[PDB]
RNA sequence: GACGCAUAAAGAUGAGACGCGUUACAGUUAAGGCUCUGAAAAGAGCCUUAAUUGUAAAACGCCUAUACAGUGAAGGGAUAUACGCUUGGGUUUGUCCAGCCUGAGCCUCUAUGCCAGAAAUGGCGCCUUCAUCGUGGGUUAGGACA
DNA sequence: CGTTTGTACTCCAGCG
DNA sequence: CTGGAGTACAAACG
DNA sequence: TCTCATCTTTATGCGT
């Protein structure tokens, strides 16, 4: 669930960024900085990289103080007033989704009929310790009051030197009194002492004039796969770079090897990225959502076998209903009427054979395994010759 | 031994951000190629590759306008609010979940931030209503039986 | 003899 | 890892 | 990468 959490975080971060840009745009247009002005362009471009602020910046990505200093420069040269600068800076520092962590995960008492955080019941946790000391109850209460009061620590040290308590007990007392007690207690206050689901791939591909391609950095192009590089000059340069540093097969050059091979360096000090042809894909796996073209591995949901007016079987792949509007290529246009439908992992048999197979990968001629007696080998049979068991 | 407490390490789950990468469109720069013009140097157009700048997209969908957000005013602010309790709802489907979001009523449990102040306290964040201005918001890349 | 299914083989997938 | 993709060669239906 | 919160398991003590 870690990767789904990361995708969810990327999605929500982008949504928050759309929220921040809209509010800034509305406010700047409300002042008089319409989108043609230089102040709108500068302040709006700075909002795409508003910086971090989780750590403090020393005295006089980027930190948010650097970004806000640039925003201050942009608005002062744009003749803005201090209230408008303050409101724009308020938009830069605004929190759009509420960060809620104080009371989220709750623990229930183990007794047969919510438990507090440990940091809120330090008195009870100290009372759990000092209740077993041999001294009287008035001294127990005085010790409990002295431990929790941060000024009376010397009295506690005097008590422990007097009564010769164990070092681990003194340790426990000071960690209950002082430390940041993360978590909740086992008991309440009355009882302390008593495969996959992704429709498409994450990186969009470029699909122009029938050619599927994408950009990869020079340090991401494996040695045996150099021929996918579209640029002739950089393909031969990368071939000579692989020949120079004795990369046999598999993984690529490192950062230092790529820089020493003479490749250009980008402004963020990464290596240049090359346009490469994408293998292992086809035009039938291409979907377009907004501007982006993606590969989908869930493009087929089943196989439909049709009987025409001549009584002859023909197989057509049933495409995914969730993606049918987004396929670039036209859908199947079957003649006649449907006879039967073959889903993935259905058990089938082959015309003229007695063995029982099951569909591993599907299509017009789906790929079938033997259920019993398969050595891991498979074979493809036309779906017109199959029938469901 | 069991249980509780404290410490430490590792892992998991949820939340919120900062960046890199990818893609689409537009601009700029460099290198190369093709074509036209010219007495020639070279001028111009198109294409490719790389770098660079800006803007936009990153589930499909479903639900929500009886919603969501901004601004201003007024009132409340521990005798309070909700991340809590009780009971519903959206995602949600063929059925059931998780996770997240959320309505109404409520304060038994749980939680309650930032700043100035030794402190009482105050001011913001927060809650409600009204006015005004807009069109926005939640959840979806995870499971189980079908 | 000319299409048309059918093996053999190789390649594909976001991350600090 | 699944659930495909393309390509080369080939053996089989019409 | 960073921040915030909780949970589980494994030790090592202490207490009943």
Numbering used by the authors: 44 to 103, 134 to 186, 190 to 270, 549 to 743
Q: Please, what does the article write about this entry?
A:
Here, we report the cryo-EM structures of a Cas9d nuclease (747 amino acids in length) in multiple functional states, revealing a stepwise process of DNA targeting involving a conformational switch in a REC2 domain insertion. To cleave a specific site in dsDNA, Type II CRISPR-Cas nucleases associate with a single guide RNA (sgRNA), a chimeric CRISPR RNA (crRNA)-trans-activating crRNA (tracrRNA), targeting a region complementary to the first 18-24 nucleotides of the 5ʹ end of the sgRNA, termed the spacer. These nucleases cleave the target and non-target strands using the HNH and RuvC endonuclease domains, respectively. We show that Cas9d contains an intricately folded sgRNA that acts as a structural scaffold to anchor flexibly tethered protein domains. Structural comparison of Cas9d with other Cas9 nucleases and the ancestral IscB reveals a common ribonucleoprotein core furnished with increasingly large protein regulatory domains, which were acquired during evolutionary specialization.
Cas9d efficiently cleaved its target plasmid, confirming accurate assembly of the enzyme with its sgRNA. We then determined the cryo-EM structure of a Cas9d–sgRNA–target dsDNA complex in its product state at a nominal resolution of ~2.7 Å. However, neither of the endonuclease domains were resolved in this structure, suggesting that they are both disordered after dsDNA cleavage or more generally sample multiple conformational states. While the conformational heterogeneity of the HNH domain in other Cas9 endonucleases has been well-documented, intriguingly the RuvC domain also showed flexibility in the post-cleavage state. Similarly to its closest evolutionary homologs, type II-C nucleases, including Cj.Cas9 and Cd.Cas9, both REC2 and REC 3 domains form multiple contacts with the PAM proximal and PAM distal R-loop, respectively, while the REC1 domain is wedged between the sgRNA repeat anti-repeat stem loop. In contrast, Cas9d recognizes its PAM from both the major and minor grooves of the dsDNA target. From the major groove side, Cas9d employs K715 to form a contact with the N7 amine in G-3. More notably, on the minor groove side, Cas9d uses N651 to recognize the exocyclic amine of G-2 and K649 to interact with the C-2 carbonyl in the target strand. These amino acids are essential for PAM recognition, as K649A and N651A mutations completely prevent in vivo DNA targeting by Cas9d.
